Each structure stands twice: as structure tokens, then as C-alpha cells.
Curated annotation (Swiss-Prot):
Gene: Gtf2i
Known function: Interacts with the basal transcription machinery by coordinating the formation of a multiprotein complex at the C-FOS promoter, and linking specific signal responsive activator complexes. Promotes the formation of stable high-order complexes of SRF and PHOX1 and interacts cooperatively with PHOX1 to promote serum-inducible transcription of a reporter gene deriven by the C-FOS serum response element (SRE). Acts as a coregulator for USF1 by binding independently two promoter elements, a pyrimidine-rich initiator (Inr) and an upstream E-box.
Subunit structure of this chain's protein: Homodimer (Potential). Interacts with SRF and PHOX1. Binds a pyrimidine-rich initiator (Inr) and a recognition site (E-box) for upstream stimulatory factor 1 (USF1). Associates with the PH domain of Bruton's tyrosine kinase (BTK). May be a component of a BHC histone deacetylase complex that contains HDAC1, HDAC2, HMG20B/BRAF35, KDM1A, RCOR1/CoREST, PHF21A/BHC80, ZMYM2, ZNF217, ZMYM3, GSE1 and GTF2I. Interacts with BTK and ARID3A. Interacts with isoform beta of PRKG1.
Name of the protein described by the UniProt record: General transcription factor II-I
Organ and tissue specificity: Ubiquitous.
Interval of the full protein contained in this chain: 733 to 818 of 998
Cross-link (Glycyl lysine isopeptide (Lys-Gly) (interchain with G-Cter in SUMO2)): K91
Family according to the record: Belongs to the TFII-I family.
Post-translational modification: Transiently phosphorylated on tyrosine residues by BTK in response to B-cell receptor stimulation.
Phosphoserine modifications at: S59
Amino acid sequence: GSSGSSGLKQKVENLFNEKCGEALGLKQAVKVPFALFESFPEDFYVEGLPEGVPFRRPSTFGIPRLEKILRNKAKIKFIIKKPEMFETAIKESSGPSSG
């Protein structure tokens, strides 16, 4: 046996995705446009995150570090300064609804 976490990763996954959508004021999940945060960090960023726990991908953190996040899944918050730039993402995304 050599792999590591599994569910947590997924769990934290939806977490972010969700928060994202919620950030825009949606009731669904929206692929976290990390890029937007990577290209425009001085506009988009997640807050509430735990100490020594950045808003990086969940497909890297540890088993504990993963929980550390979830633990504060209510404290975590997404700050969107330029939501008009997110529409593209929300538009790009297809999900279970090809429109």
C-alpha cells in the first residue's frame, strides 16, 4: 500500500469548487479558476485558510494538512475583486449541463 489520502482530496475538492460558486453567489460548485488566482493573485484569493496552509491544490497536501483545511471549511472564504473576469470560467465550465 503506497498512495496516501483519497477521499479528503476529493472532499477538499468540492469544498473549494463550492466556495468558488458561492463566492460568485451561486448555489452550485464552480471549477476553482486557480489560474485566475495564479495570474491575478492581487485580486483573487481565498481567506480563512489555516496557518501554513495556502490555497494550493488538494492534490498535494498531506493526510492531516487536508483535514486541517476541512476543519475550517466554514471559516474559509473566497474574495473576488474582479468577478466580471470569472464569468468566463463560469461560462467555460460545462458540468452536468451542456448549455
